[PDB]
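Form 12-C: Joint structure prediction
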Amino acid sequence: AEVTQLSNGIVVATEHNPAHTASVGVVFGSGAANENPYNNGVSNLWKNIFLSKENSAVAAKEGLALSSNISRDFQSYIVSSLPGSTDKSLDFLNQSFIQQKANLLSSSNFEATKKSVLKQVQDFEDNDHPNRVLEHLHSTAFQNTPLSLPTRGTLESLENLVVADLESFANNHFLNSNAVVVGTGNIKHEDLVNSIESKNLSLQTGTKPVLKKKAAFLGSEVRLRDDTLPKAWISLAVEGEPVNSPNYFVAKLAAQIFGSYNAFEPASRLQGIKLLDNIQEYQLCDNFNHFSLSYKDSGLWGFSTATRNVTMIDDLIHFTLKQWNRLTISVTDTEVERAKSLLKLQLGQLYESGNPVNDANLLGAEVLIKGSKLSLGEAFKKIDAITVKDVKAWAGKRLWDQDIAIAGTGQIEGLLDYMRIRSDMSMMRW
Amino acid sequence: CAEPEHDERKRLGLKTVIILSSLYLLSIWVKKFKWAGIKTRKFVFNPPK
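Section 2 - Result
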């Protein structure tokens, strides 16, 4: 458990633990939330040439493995080494992001990569209905606002993208003040920071990105009815918490109370979740899962679900929203306590997997926003300190009689109108 | 003699008509609000391959 971050000319962040391999990468503070409607998908395209057969063979000769991830707030390019080769990873990083960042964009490479992210993003829209729905949830929830842009980009902005768009983006966002270099694995801080302060040369230092306009939640829906699909997939959310919200953890705990479910897993049917008494009688769904998604400016708190019970979708939604009503008025001590324990377990399994590439992404994203990483033991202190009173005060502000955002696809004829769903965000009282 | 309730009847009518008028104007507003999602709803068609 370590967090050593220090700024030379660039900002260097590491977290070392004797494991096996080491992962080095640069993580930029700009993602799909920084694109336009019209160059949407430029980051995903950058990712895909960085992993192209040409660049990927040059790394595999050296015994290096490549990894990249496009998100909303950020963007990361990562090389995993075998831990004494922690220097030959920094060679491949700079040989790409200074030298080859004019050789990767060759006409034959770009056209074969663009053709591959087109088959890629098309395949997504055709078949991945849960993530497709969740992506459209962000699209309508945050419409005409940076968080609405999908991470993979749209088929139409993608096929109209040229080399100059990659260039213009790279020249405005792959800057020094919008970068953090991250090392996870087992390698020391002073083992890496010296290999970085070895070579100087700043490259476009002093240049800031471009500013924008703030993200906002708009209560709304997008309904992607398709009667030929064998199920209905729906996601429903309120405006949640940004990272570095006081209620960052209260929100995450609230989502753990209702948790996630899988009708076919015997153990899942037995969880201490009151909602399960309602939904199992007539089998109202195959699965659901609650989430508290947090970004820089905003977040989404809600749930997603999939079902073949297409004539009782209204009972699914009704029982789920009646449970959420309880958070404001009647959530019990032992529900909160169950959530604490399970939130710790899952937050643990995230922050300490046996895979440094995940560690890098979690470290990178955190330090880009607040300039530091809160340690796992520090989180548990915050989690344990949450009372029933906290959850109630949170839910009464975020959940009770608040606008929602809805998205769905498949057989959603039985998903009732907006106002019916929205009325269930509260209860009648004297 | 024929209409002994005249004066009182018109006094009650004045109250009844004021309350019902208000309830009418009010319900129009409440209906429009409850219908706003449906009235401004928008569709797009992308013909399936």
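Section 3 - Comments
The CA atoms of residues 259 and 290 of chain A lie 5 Å apart. Chain A touches chain B at residues 417-419 (CB under 8 Å).
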